Amino acid sequence: RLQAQRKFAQS
Amino acid sequence: KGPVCWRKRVKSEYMRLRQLKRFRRADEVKSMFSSNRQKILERTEILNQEWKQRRIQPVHILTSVSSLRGTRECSVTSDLDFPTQVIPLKTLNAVASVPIMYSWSPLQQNFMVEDETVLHNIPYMGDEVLDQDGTFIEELIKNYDGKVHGDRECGFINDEIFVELVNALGQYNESRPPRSDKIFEAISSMFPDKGTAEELKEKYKELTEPPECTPNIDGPNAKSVQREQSLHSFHTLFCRRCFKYDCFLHPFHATPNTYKRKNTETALDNKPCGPQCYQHLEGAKEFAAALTAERIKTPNIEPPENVEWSGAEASMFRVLIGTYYDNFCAIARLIGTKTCRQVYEFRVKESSIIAPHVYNYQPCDHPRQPCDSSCPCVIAQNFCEKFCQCSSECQNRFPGCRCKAQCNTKQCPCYLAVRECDPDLCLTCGAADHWDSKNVSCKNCSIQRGSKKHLLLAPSDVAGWGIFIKDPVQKNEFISEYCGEIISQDEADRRGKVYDKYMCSFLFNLNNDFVVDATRKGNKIRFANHSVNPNCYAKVMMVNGDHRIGIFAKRAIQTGEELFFDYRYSQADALKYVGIE
Amino acid sequence: TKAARMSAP
Amino acid sequence: KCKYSFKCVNSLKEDHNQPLFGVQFNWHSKEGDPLVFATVGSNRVTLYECHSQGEIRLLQSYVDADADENFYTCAWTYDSNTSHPLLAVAGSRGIIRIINPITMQCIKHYVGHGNAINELKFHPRDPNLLLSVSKDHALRLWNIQTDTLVAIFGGVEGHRDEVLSADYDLLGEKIMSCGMDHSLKLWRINSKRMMNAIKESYDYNPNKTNRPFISQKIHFPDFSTRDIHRNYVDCVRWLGDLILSKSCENAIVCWKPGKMEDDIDKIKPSESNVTILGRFDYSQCDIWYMRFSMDFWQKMLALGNQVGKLYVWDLEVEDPHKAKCTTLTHHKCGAAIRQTSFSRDSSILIAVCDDASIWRWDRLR
Amino acid sequence: HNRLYFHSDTCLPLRPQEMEVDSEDEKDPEWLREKTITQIEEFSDVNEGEKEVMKLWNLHVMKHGFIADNQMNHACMLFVENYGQKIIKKNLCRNFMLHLVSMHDFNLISIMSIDKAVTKLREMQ
Ligand SMILES: Nc1ncnc2c1ncn2[C@@H]1O[C@H](CSCC[C@H](N)C(=O)O)[C@@H](O)[C@H]1O
Ligand SMILES: [Zn+2]
Ligand SMILES: [Zn+2]
Ligand SMILES: [Zn+2]
Ligand SMILES: [Zn+2]
Ligand SMILES: [Zn+2]
Ligand SMILES: [Zn+2]
Ligand SMILES: [Zn+2]
Ligand SMILES: [Zn+2]
């Protein structure tokens, strides 16, 4: 798949 | 043959092609890189020289006068073991913020938009949201059949590589299809954004590729052509309803009996042309009337003049006889470069050659039979209109109104049917009256004429942007049409999921078939807010074959008031804010 | 799935 | 082997701990003048001066009175009359503020945008022509001398979602832009319509006429494609006549409109083709809003990723690339690197991070 | 007064001297005009030719906002008064005649207006 890319890392 | 065996071979073929194209291109790109580096060098140099002429006195810092202890400070720490740096903080003051607005194109009339099957964007709302609840993105992709641009196992595709793949697919294959139908399914699976396979099939044909065409009559290549071929483009592309070619509002083509006309009138005897006319021996008017009488069923002793007929002239003649029907007098005047005698001669030569809930309205054309329970108009429960190719006296047509004046009351049959007047039927009230002074005796034609009031954009007292009326208006006066894109109910649902999540939608329901979406293109009235006690109301009127939304004053409205109307929701999605005072 | 839409009588 | 080598002489961290989304060296300063750079993060813009060796001197820091404001981007220019340097900052609130550091005051502000401004750029040849790109799906071109909005680059064929980046060409004749919609769109400004509009922006005076300035509205780009990348495009740069753009695809792609042979100035809007010349491979940059930069002579390319790793490439390399890139890592640099900036000479390479850290990298002796 | 208003195309505020809103009559969106030109040209399998005469007509009806059929006689007459000069420059005289024939087939114009129009067009030749 491909997902919505986010602006920041998880933590 | 295997369903996955085609894809597997397709994927491998695609990898092989991408390789050698790249191995070969490396030679060219290396040549292009040096060339580009040359352009970079020249242009960087030109910028650099311009920099040398400039003196900017940069790099200044200030501390004095000593800080008064009423200013906050900015501290920066260093790994280098140097002492930490502290500077007073200078405030940037008092800039008003404007309400949020995404850009939109303006419209005077609604715009038809095809459904988009694959969404090419995933809305970013969710980093602050932290994916919750993510089922929304998953269900959002459901609506596009799981198709997002670009979701695929493969990485890159372009037109040049795409053609080579189809060609390589064709040669891979026994022979010949010649061009294969099974394969467009195979690659459409590898590329959900490119699919459907038929769209790829059409796109392939687009790239591959002048018959059948009719060259320019006004051209170096004019050829002698039948009347239908010379007009094939105008007939097939023109819209009877709004009078343009390839219009933006009506998707369907000619009916096509609409371009056919009455053979009459009046088949009259007119003479002399004149004087070098088609006369006067037997068969001037007689052989002409005989031939058309002989052709309809289901002399000429003087020798004809010797002239040469160009492609354009013959094709134009064949066109003009279709519409003037043996009035060679008039044909020759319009052809211009020939005379009445010569037109007749050519007709004679030609004769002796041997041929080898509400539903959106659509016109009906069942030519000889009447508009009864099989007619799409009555099936749909809509009147036939001027656009219908049925009988002049069809019982299911809407007559106009005979009103004297404003016909803004139930006594006008137009107004009572929630239809605006017809400029072609309502010949007494003034809907047909003088166009330029657009304010007129008939007050049931504002939407057709775009007689909208002047609206002012300003931050709403209620929510975000709002819209305000400049000059006052009285009760039931027309304010403006609610224009926007026209889209199917399915497309509105997909756009709606994202609009609802975003918390704002410009969606407005038109009828069973279509919804008006003011989001991407629309008009100023789109900024009108919701209110349970509004000052404006909406009528979906039926206007010259089209459904159009009209925004009117529910009450007398004073200068500078903000306009609101009842959205007709359940609802708190999400207003929840009516009303101030 | 029923995206909110404006309506008229 | 590989070029070029740097070493981390200093690292400094701001007090708010909010991410620094932009860093820009002042390339306008005359040679022999110290190398200045600006950083934007949180609701403040801060100015620092580079001094030999490894010392970075904190020069100025300004804060927006609005606590909610958040700056995303900045760009340097000058006032050609008084010859001052000028710095522009824009961000989430969708407002452009102009700081004049010599006066250390905010002289101008422009609030015409509907939403956050993702990037700012200045015309190479015209210091008054500022290009602003926004989340409202529009690019705006301003004349900051006359305080006029020259043009809006949005409409029917405009971007469908947020515009994330844009870049002028070296000559200032054309713009390339990109955004969430996956599309890169070319906007020529050497056309008669645009050249005339700029000229009329200068002639405009509000004291002379009751009418407003009529801003040109361009609904149609001179080229557009979505065949390069497969997700949000967050950084696009002009490499001569070629385009450099990146996506959450782990590579900066060098491509051009048209077939291989097609000249960029002979490209018609209807053009279907793009040609990929080469890729710049990297890893672990999956988040969007990660920008790359180049030096003035465009010899080296720099991109920081989300795990605190910087990549530097040589733009004079023949053939892919492929190989090879010089990678520099530091054991205390672990946060995402939003943007990099070279000094006018290539000597210094600043990088700024999600954790308010700044990282100074110097070149070989 | 004062509520402060803003322009819709450009969200810049409206100074009190400008409103006075609006002396100008609305409207024909310019993008629509460019869309039609670019959309007609897009046609594979149409004359150059036919395209140019269609573009001129489309622009003409868009400019004046014709709603009714009775307007189409006056419309074909205006189209030579305004675009006739350009029709002669491009050697579009006979395609403009085909258009007049088409328009008559669609039952919009009287036949007396085909002649009356080519007469006026050739009267300015
Ligand atoms: N009365 C109200 N209270 C809260 N939000 C409203 C509202 N009326 C309209 N809106 C918002 O606007 C949308 C309709 S479009 C109306 C224009 C909008 N107020 C704007 O400033 O741009 C609704 O979906 C809702 O999000
Ligand atoms: Zn139509
Ligand atoms: Zn005659
Ligand atoms: Zn009927
Ligand atoms: Zn019928
Ligand atoms: Zn009917
Ligand atoms: Zn009526
Ligand atoms: Zn009536
Ligand atoms: Zn009426």
Numbering used by the authors:
A (entry chain E): 1 to 11
B (entry chain A): 10 to 182, 211 to 216, 220 to 249, 257 to 345, 422 to 479, 516 to 740
C (entry chain D): 22 to 30
D (entry chain B): 77 to 441
E (entry chain C): 561 to 685
Provide the authors' own sentences about this structure as they appear in the paper.
The polycomb group of proteins (PcG) are multi-subunit complexes that maintain repressive chromatin states by silencing the expression of certain genes.
We have solved the crystal structure of a human PRC2 complex that contains the essential elements of the EZH2 and EED polypeptides with the Vefs fragment of the SUZ12 subunit. The second, based on the oncogenic histone H3 mutation H3K27M, binds to the SET domain and inhibits its methyltransferase activity. The crystal structure was solved using a combination of phases from zinc anomalous scattering and molecular replacement (see Methods section). There were four copies of the PRC2 complex in the crystallographic asymmetric unit and the final model was refined at 2.9 Å resolution, and relevant crystallographic statistics are given in Table 1. The complex forms a compact arrangement of three lobes with overall dimensions of approximately 120 × 75 × 50 Å. Here, the position of the guanidinium group of Arg-26 is compatible with hydrogen bonds to the side chains of Asp-652 and Gln-648 of EZH2. In the human complex, the chain from residue 726 takes the opposite trajectory and forms a canonical post-SET structure, contributing residues Tyr-726 and Tyr-728 to the lysine-access channel. However in the complex, the Jarid2 peptide makes additional interactions with residues from the SRM moiety of the EZH2 N-domain.
